[model samples]
Target: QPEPDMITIFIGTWNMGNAPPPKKITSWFLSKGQGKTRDDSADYIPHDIYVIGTQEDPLSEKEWLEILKHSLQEITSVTFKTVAIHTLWNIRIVVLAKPEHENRISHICTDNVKTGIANTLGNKGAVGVSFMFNGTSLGFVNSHLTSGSEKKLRRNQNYMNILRFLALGDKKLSPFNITHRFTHLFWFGDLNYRVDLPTWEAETIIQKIKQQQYADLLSHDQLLTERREQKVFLHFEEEEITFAPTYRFERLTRDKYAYTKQKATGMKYNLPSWCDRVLWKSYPLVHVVCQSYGSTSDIMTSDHSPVFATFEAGVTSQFVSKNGPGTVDSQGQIEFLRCYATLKTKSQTKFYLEFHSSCLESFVKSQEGENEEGSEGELVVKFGETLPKLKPIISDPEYLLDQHILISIKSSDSDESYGEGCIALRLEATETQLPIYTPLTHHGELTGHFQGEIKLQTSQ
Candidate 1:
């Protein structure tokens, strides 16, 4: 059996409540909390990958990114580089890696979906980043969904819209789902799901947190309930919550929940819920082990506490087959060829796909049925939209390998080519159903991207 290369990753999420960051957040970045102390002279163990998500961030992307970059370097001698940074309104996410691994990262892309009022604003939305780390595909989504104790349905809608509109790679892939597109995914931020109980009841349960009693609170968590019904975050997993709820804290205070007082009845009104959270999922081909899940109570700059998790993620790409070393499968099984494409332009710029003669034969032959009408070699597409949905077509999958499928972006008004990209199909049995991403370039500059896959039909 072959062993995989393992790397440590630290993921943290915080709802800053539109507050400015402190002079230095080293304590939170270094995983220094209530019980754990740091040695100023001793160097700490640094993580290979660092993921940080913030909601309602008040600072600009540049300022916040600079703050994060500087603070991460305080922990040890290892230097870190920003692999990608994306921000949508107040939601921001930054991905960083050690300098040694900088060149190994590829296919870096960022996208966002607006769930705000009428889906026109960025106030409530998600900003995501997808990239390949060495041979492993990883994605990060930092979202701030609807906020309300009783608006579970609306939150669910927002969740779906985010997943539907958020496309990580070029155009939407065959599945058109982010979870299935990446080998490992991390979703974190102020999801805004609340506790089922009202202010008083939830407070009573939260009070028991001092005794480390979280079972009662978690039992009434809205997110957990949604997950239990399989209505949201399908196939996602979260670590145990050993800390108290990290929401509705008194502004600029540590370890205190906020509340509103009624003048006459003097009743305290507030629902302390676990709004800030971190969740992850990974494909079976790779392993991800969560080593620690915790919250930072030392930082009081925001209304909600920061939550972080550390993991040992498998990261390596080998050329050998799973059955053994250097022995390729003998069977020549061919399946359907699935392709997805997208190109963005101005609203009035009408565009269509122009398949070249080099790939016309393979494209027409790869269709589902022999009697199916063949393409005239041109397919009109809506501006900045995905190509028409295509099903897996039966064919010799290996025949498409190294075959350049020319796709040109042509305008209807001028009948001239604007830009184009080529697709080179590939297949690795070890990585089941993983579509390869390619950049669309014109005149030596990137214009868009293309994602293609060839599935080898097989049955036991």
Candidate 2:
């Protein structure tokens, strides 16, 4: 079972200011917040993955998880299922995937960075999750940088701080940044970069924005300016921002700016900026298209409005084009290069486990452990009921102890079997008192699957 190469992605960011969110607004927001900025499909197109980023949220981490699940369910009529979520303090990032694509995802990993005070405070930092999409690694970040109109450098360093201490896989070797490692990357946040213009000048620019003159005003935007100079967010594609500033909105009024502020010491006026943003980068193997980008004009929970983007992402290469085989079991210490084979000989305990690799030296070898006669685990495989052996083998092997070989398994049920048109493999613990365990093996389970065909030389 597999998913198609094409998939859809949605990224949304909001800062709740640690306020208790009433559940009433969320349902309506999901239904109406669906964008019409641009139409991609002739009919409705259900999303494959939904990525949400939040900052300064008031709810507990678990509470927020339920909220996200609820949002995914109430958003669109399409089917969506949650895979995992990463949260630190008030910052949360969640992933909701379609059912078909849920099980196919592998090697899931999560890490958090606290860049407050000195770039490691949970109150104001980032939380992220990274996993394989069709075998190509993808990383997503939801951050809340330092909050201040003039803290542009702090925001840039906040990003660096995340990179320095940030760990993705195993937390020992890498971060989500190695451009080549993650085929596609998404970073969104309430990045407090402001308008470089003085209040009056920016106010004038804002007036021009009424007529949709956003480009000229954007030239003075601090984030875009810094990105242009390569100071930060290098190479990430920020889709054209055709909307107005997403910050400083009044609680009741959805369109106008919150102009209740007093002028500064020498400043003529207070300038509003697009403090919220979403950006992404797709490498050679991923084809990411930005179909729509705009602020959700309806959500009125906080002074800062929420922003969203819809993307159509597809893989140019097959899921395992590089790893070369049947699903990379990044979760297991070992993996199956090829599924087990089966044979029918009218015996319940005779089967050949083929293509097991050595996991310790970089391969999963149930056959290798079988070659050494008990390396995978100290378990015993009984080939027949009338064997000369009287002692027992280990109950479960911790590691992948066996390799490609004819497993000698026995039926534990003395109840007896027809022994015809049926086959089974029973695991046993060694009675030598050595007591080998299965903690590192098949989940410490006492039995292995005997499901297979009864062949001339049945194998699994």
Candidate 3:
């Protein structure tokens, strides 16, 4: 099997105009709690309160940044944020990339189509980011099309406009070619069209894009087979559990009238709907692991819940050898080795290489070396006596390869009155390891005739 080159992106669209004022209050609460608590918790509170005009404040930008940062941090993998071209009073699109491909993120653009055209037609339009992964280049476009029957025609037209933009927008730059290097395109957002609705016209747009060779990620062959057998939207519902409703008007508690109505009527607060979505172009380079739309319930942060997708990319296979290096069995293949051995070797190699190449480079660059006459190299030494202390430093290539630890030495000095002479011996051993430390002596005496100490000195 070929290695997969996949990337996961968390895409979210929030319509925060309903109650902007309360959004500001939420933002204030968040700013005040910054560093004191996790951002997820801070912003989670606002998920329930609707703040009118809240999206327009600078605080909104801060809140969004915080939310994005918090979201990205939760994952151990790579991630970053990309801004959209069009900035609405209550609408914004955020793109998150996996760590390995962050540098590949080159350009972010929004459909420069005028709002006049969009508002007249009622289609919200689209924004996109262009990035590279492995050898393939792709574009991710996020959009919110018109919702409801009243604006159905305009929405359909706007959707088509976006497709045209994707298919042919750069007429001057490429002269009948798409200059974006977009081998794969993922267009996902709130299209406001439901698949179950027979009258839905968005299917026409979906069909149009499918004809263009863009596959709906959710429509996999296995999933289709499963759906046929189960006879319901079981898979859809299961996926939906990962991400719930993203739209909630009551959460935006910005309007006094709405707040009063809430106070007067014992109505349960509605959580935001996760109507937003993700769409992608069918290409061999990308594979979706999971995709969902959901909300942060405890916190009333945005009117719309978040949508996210995980994808795998740049995958490569590695061969594992059993026994030892170059050991082969009768079949001319290496004998079966424990999986743990292969994994351990690979992890160690990766760590060492990363340490030598990345951590060492940084460490070496920071060192003053022999150039500083009076200054000794910023060297540190560690004794290998206890596994706990030594294991951490050695295992961490960052620390192991760091220029900070110049030399480590075990002590030979002995003096019963000097306690174990451990401290003095360790220091002396460190001094001996370094050229500059040759003339230096132990400033204090050593005691104790027991086991010697370990020493570490800086490198010059």
lDDT of 2 by residue, 1-460 (tens): 4446667777878777566665654422232343336443322445677788888787776787677666655555555676668888878887878777866687788888888674435477888888876635577888888766667888888877765555663332211233223556788988877767765565576577567677766888889998888677765798887777777666645667753345531332336677888888665324689877777666677877777777888642232222224333332221112222222223343322321121121211132111112344423232221212111121122221221112222223331211111111212321121211111101111133232221111111
Estimate the TM-score of every prediction: 0.68, 0.63, 0.40
Scored by TM-score, the top model is 1
Clashing pairs in 1: 336-393
Report per-prediction Cα RMSD to one decimal: 11.2, 18.1, 24.9
Per lDDT, what order, best first? 1, 2, 3
Give all candidates' CA lDDT scores. Answer: 0.65, 0.55, 0.31
Model 2, residue 23: displacement in angstroms?
A: 4.5
- Per-residue lDDT for 1-460 in model 3, tens only? 3433344343333444343323232222232221112245433322111111112123465666564555444433223443333334334444444444444444444442322253354335555555434334455555566554234345445555554454322222221112222444555555443222223333443443334332332332222333455421111222322332334334433111111224433442221222455444332222344323333333444444333333332221122234212332221210101100001011111110000111111211111111111123322221122211121112221122221211111222221111101111122233233212211111111111112222232221
Q: Sorted on TM-score, highest at the top, how do the candidates line up?
A: 1, 2, 3
TM-score comparison, 2 vs 3, better candidate: 2
Measured with C-alpha atoms, the lDDT of residue 447 in candidate 2 is 32
Candidate maximizing lDDT:
1
Off by over 4 Å in 2: 21-44, 118-122, 169-178, 259-270, 316-460
Candidate 1 Cα outliers beyond 4 Å, as residue runs: 1-4, 34-43, 119-122, 170-172, 261-269, 318-460
TM-score of 1: 0.68
Candidate 1 lDDT over residue span 119-175, tens digit each: 536488899999877656788899898876767777777777776678895342322
